[PDB]
Design a protein around this ligand. Structure first.
Ligand SMILES: *[C@@H]1O[C@H](CO)[C@@H](O[C@@H]2O[C@H](CO)[C@@H](O[C@@H]3O[C@H](CO)[C@@H](O)[C@H](O)[C@@H]3O)[C@H](O)[C@H]2NC(C)=O)[C@H](O)[C@H]1NC(C)=O
Ligand SMILES: *[C@@H]1O[C@H](CO)[C@@H](O[C@@H]2O[C@H](CO)[C@@H](O)[C@H](O)[C@H]2NC(C)=O)[C@H](O)[C@H]1NC(C)=O
Ligand SMILES: *[C@@H]1O[C@H](CO)[C@@H](O[C@@H]2O[C@H](CO)[C@@H](O)[C@H](O)[C@H]2NC(C)=O)[C@H](O)[C@H]1NC(C)=O
Ligand SMILES: *[C@@H]1O[C@H](CO)[C@@H](O[C@@H]2O[C@H](CO)[C@@H](O)[C@H](O)[C@H]2NC(C)=O)[C@H](O)[C@H]1NC(C)=O
Ligand SMILES: *[C@@H]1O[C@H](CO)[C@@H](O)[C@H](O)[C@H]1NC(C)=O
Lengths: 103, 480, 104, 483
């Protein structure tokens, strides 16, 4: 069928992944395609569930990589990261900021 | 044509018998001369203040007289004397304030009498005296206050009567005593609040009773004496409950209407022994805690009973219910479910908003006629894998708002509607395959809908060339 | 609007009749037009209501004119009238027909 | 080697920053990891790769290694000196291995480690002081494991943690001060466990916690320990066995924005239970039969969506709408409502659903000045009479449902040109309704068919695909009418 895959269709690709893998759904030309990965690509975050493990896009403003939703793991350059979120200026400061951009 | 009055329109009935139409001609008085052999005389919408100081009897072949909309305030005693062949008299939409005290007497051949749409409030006793052929009586849209029990005591040949749209508030015992031949009685749109216990004891041949649009506070128990009753209507009242053994005296009932009544409770044996009854609907009877007994009424095709507190169904519920097609026990408190297998011929089932926690194996086995199954808004944590294995005709399935995580897919292939929203733990993908012919889908998550494909010039050439394919891709719905 | 009418539309005809008259809707076109009459034409019967008076088609097998539904006033010739419905043969008792065709 | 080493055989390398190398050796089916491995490596991916034992031949001196991935391997353990030379290690990935315990000493003193993934293993034991010397650790994954109890001892050193997942385990109890020292913790995931009992001071540790996930668990009572999380913003305890929300439940947690408690057998909710949550936007309460009174919402006026169904609410306060500005959708269906308040003060209202109530009449002011209202459902009530001007001031009204309400007449003032009109079940409604003073009607339900007969029954590229789909729905739709 495919790498780390158990159930596939020619149209939609992989429909069910191996036990501990994550499924990634991305839209190719009016059609949805599923890939099986050991961990999710940049922009996505890994979410495990008793039925389906899925790669989930993290819609957080100015966030490059995230732990879940509402919490960013790595913020974009030129933007400070404080408690899993991204601001132009850090409210408390003090703990912000060294040479790095991580309050 | 002499014989036919000027400005009027005549036409042959039986050969050399005349039907005369002199309706909306704005006559001040009825036609002059006019010919014998007239078997039909229509004077309607015609400003006739008084039928005449010079009436025209000698029309002994007159079969039908119409005198509607003529604004008559009274009818003289000798008005219809010569009319020996009169079968039907029409006196509607006039300003009569009382039934003619003597004018209608001894019309031996009179079969149907229309005195509706008047202002009649008083019905003098022995005004219908000598009407032995009278079968049909209209007295609706009038100002009656009370059942003219005395006047009605002579009409033992009546078959159909309407006292609707009046102001009758009370029906005494034996109000229609001598009316043994009466078959159809209309008392709808009245102010009937109280009726005696023996108020309907008279009519033995009554088949339809209309007490609709009235002001009843209690179930009319007087009904108990009408053995031959077939159709019963008492909807749009203020009745609060149907008592035990309510229709005990009325088998061979076919239709019963009691909607728009604030019904809270119904006796268990209340609907027993009605073998001709085909449909039973009971909406919002909150005080019902038990499923009704239907012994001797196995000819039900549609049973709906909602908004109650039914905790459980007897194991052998379907033993009482062959021929049943539609079952709707939505909005109840059901936890366990019986076999339902004995309930063959079942086409539709609706069990939404109940407290159902589990679907066993046999609970839906061998329902080959079943088409729609709604189990939405329950607490169904687990379904047996083979629960739907034997449902060939199943096309619509609703399992919305449940506690499901997985799904038994064996059988069930190619249904038309599938609804699975509210099942938050249902996150796995569902293929377009092992599910063709699907046209309407509800899904807990959008990415599952996407699996079913719902996610200058020469672009128009693209649209036109690939038309049937595109419309074939838009022939599927999916709400996330 | 029209004769014996108070509220009409050019497209649909009469929509409301004078107080005590009956509305007749056809429905033979594929389009519905409303006429106002003092009483209903043959095939129909008069039904009065506090809101709308309407002419109602009498769907009874072999019935020419009727008092309401389920009850026929005059049956078709060659068919006997018994208790508001029509049979070729009368059900029980008499059920016997005279020179006339009306099972007494 | 020792400086000039190539790309490992069968592997795929690619330049990162100048003079830094990314080495991808994933899905090559290695028995052992690459031998002659190079410095300048800043990214090493060995995934889905049959590594029974990480090495007898260690590879430190990769002091520029930023990221190590070791997923999908067959590792049962991690030797103590495994990650010694890795001074620049920021992220370590060890998921989908057969680890039965967190490495007793192997993970110690990785100074720069920020994110550690030990999920999808078989770990059941977390030895104390296994996380000792991790000053940069911000993110910890420990889900899909066989944990039985919160390693309170092991967690006592991670005072810099910000995000933790202990989901998909077998945790049944949360002791007092279980996460005591985790003061910097912001996000805690405990969903999909077997948590039945939790202490009263079990969450007293984390002062900076903002989201708590207790979903898919086995709680019988509302978790009162919640009261100590002042900075909490998102709360999840849905799919449990909680029977009621007590009075003053979220008293300790203002600035709450989202709360999830669905799939809980909730029958009763305290009146003041949802007081003082000004940042809350949505309140949904379905099937709480034991509720007899409308809930008080003092200090929480930013509700945009209020739905409360299947209860026994007999009446609404006169000044109910005083508490609900900004409200958009209101749904009090399946209750026992007879009289209705003004609802005029509740502007910005877009949708209203009051079906299956015992409403007998619609007054004048009960729907006045609702200029944003679009959908009004009053089906299955006992509304005998409606004031003529009841709907006079609803310009944006397009959907109206009055099904099964024993109506005889109808108010036609205003209301012109709506989209949906439903009047079935009103048996006394027999009069005719014109096509005029009613254009734009597309969906109609009618008590009688002859009333239906009165309505004529018997630049961008490839977005044109989308325009075709929009245009497909409308215009292919003719006027509908079901009797
Ligand atoms: C995936 O990993 C497993 C374990 O690391 C690999 O299993 C190993 O397979 C080899 C041969 O296929 C076995 O070799 C044997 O060695 C013994 C000496 O111990 C020798 O006497 C035998 O004749 C045989 O050659 C090895 O024992 C076995 N490992 C274990 C722990 O059983 C497997 O091959 C890997 N799969 C792939 C596709 O690389
Ligand atoms: C219809 O008949 C009535 C009588 O039933 C006529 O009534 C007359 O009305 C005028 C005023 O319009 C009075 O001055 C007369 O005294 C009335 N006469 C009688 C005998 O009542 C009425 O004029 C007639 N209308 C038409 C259009 O024919
Ligand atoms: C009650 O109805 C019966 C018929 O069922 C009447 O009996 C007939 O009355 C007429 C009087 O007009 C007699 O000529 C007949 O001989 C009676 N018997 C028959 C027709 O079999 C009875 O008179 C009615 N009673 C009252 C008080 O009106
Ligand atoms: C409990 O939390 C405190 C406060 O963050 C931690 O205190 C630090 O302890 C380490 C020793 O492991 C010192 O090197 C730091 O200087 C301390 N920081 C302070 C005092 O601000 C402590 O490590 C945590 N764990 C315990 C006490 O077991
Ligand atoms: C690594 O390189 C050295 C040369 O410096 C060589 O002797 C050794 O065999 C190589 N090992 C492998 C596994 O390629």
């Amino acid at each position: 069928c495919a790498k780390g895959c158990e159930l596939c269709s020619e149209v939609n690709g992989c429909l069910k992944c191996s036990p501990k893998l994550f499924i990634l759904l991305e839209r190719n030309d009016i059609r949805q395609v599923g890939v099986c990965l050991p961990s999710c690509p940049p922009g996505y975050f890994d979410a495990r569930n008793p039925d389906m493990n899925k790669c989930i896009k993290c819609k957080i403003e100015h966030c490059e990589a995230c732990f879940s939703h509402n919490f960013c793991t790595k913020c974009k350059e030129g933007l400070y990261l404080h408690k899993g979120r991204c601001y132009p200026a850090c409210p408390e400061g003090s703990s912000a900021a060294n040479g790095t951009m991580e309050c | 044509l002499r014989g036919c009055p000027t400005h009027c329109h005549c036409e042959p009935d039986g050969r050399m018998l005349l039907r005369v139409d002199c309706s909306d001609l704005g006559l001040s008085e009825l036609p002059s001369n006019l010919s014998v052999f007239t078997s039909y005389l229509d004077l309607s919408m015609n400003n006739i203040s008084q039928l005449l100081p010079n009436p025209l009897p000698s029309l002994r072949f007159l079969e039908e007289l119409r005198l509607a909309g003529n604004a008559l305030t009274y009818i003289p005693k000798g008005a219809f004397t010569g009319l020996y062949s009169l079968k039907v008299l029409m006196l509607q939409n006039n300003q009569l304030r009382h039934v003619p005290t003597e004018a209608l007497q001894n019309l031996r051949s009179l079969q149907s009498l229309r005195l509706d749409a008047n202002h009649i409030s008083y019905v003098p006793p022995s005004c219908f005296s000598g009407l032995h052929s009278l079968r049909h009586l209209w007295l609706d849209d009038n100002a009656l206050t009370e059942i003219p029990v005395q006047a009605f005591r002579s009409l033992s040949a009546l078959q159909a009567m309407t006292l609707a749209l009046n102001k009758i508030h009370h029906i005494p015992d034996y109000a229609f005593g001598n009316l043994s031949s009466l078959v159809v009685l209309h008392l709808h749109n009245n102010r009937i609040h109280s009726l005696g216990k023996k108020c309907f004891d008279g009519l033995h041949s009554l088949e339809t009773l209309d007490l609709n649009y009235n002001n009843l506070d209690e179930f009319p128990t007087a009904i108990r004496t009408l053995s031959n009753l077939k159709e019963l209507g008492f909807h749009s009242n203020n009745i609060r409950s149907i008592p035990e053994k309510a229709f005990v005296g009325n088998p061979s009932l076919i239709t019963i209407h009691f909607y728009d009544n604030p019904i809270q409770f119904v006796g268990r044996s209340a609907f027993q022994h009605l073998p001709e009854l085909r449909t039973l609907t009971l909406n919002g009877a909150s005080q019902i805690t038990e499923f009704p007994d239907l012994t001797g009424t196995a000819n039900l095709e549609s049973l709906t009973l909602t908004g109650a507190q039914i905790s459980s169904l007897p194991q052998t519920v379907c033993n009482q219910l062959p021929n049943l097609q539609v079952l709707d026990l939505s909005y109840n408190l059901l936890e366990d479910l019986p076999s339902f297998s004995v309930c063959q011929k079942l086409q539709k089932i609706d069990l939404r908003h109940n407290e159902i926690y589990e679907i066993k194996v046999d609970t839906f086995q061998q329902l080959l006629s079943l088409r729609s199954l709604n189990l939405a808004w329950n607490k169904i944590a687990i379904i047996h894998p083979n629960a739907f294995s034997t449902l060939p005709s199943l096309i619509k399935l609703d399992l919305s708002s449940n506690l499901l995580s997985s799904f038994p897919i064996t059988g069930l292939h190619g249904l038309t509607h599938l609804k699975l929203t509210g099942n938050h733990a249902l996150q796995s993908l569902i293929s377009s395959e092992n599910f063709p012919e699907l046209k309407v889908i509800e899904m807990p998550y959008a990415y599952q809908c996407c699996a079913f494909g719902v996610c200058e010039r020469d672009l128009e050439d693209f649209l036109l060339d690939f038309e049937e394919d595109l419309k074939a891709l838009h022939s599927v719905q999916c709400s996330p």
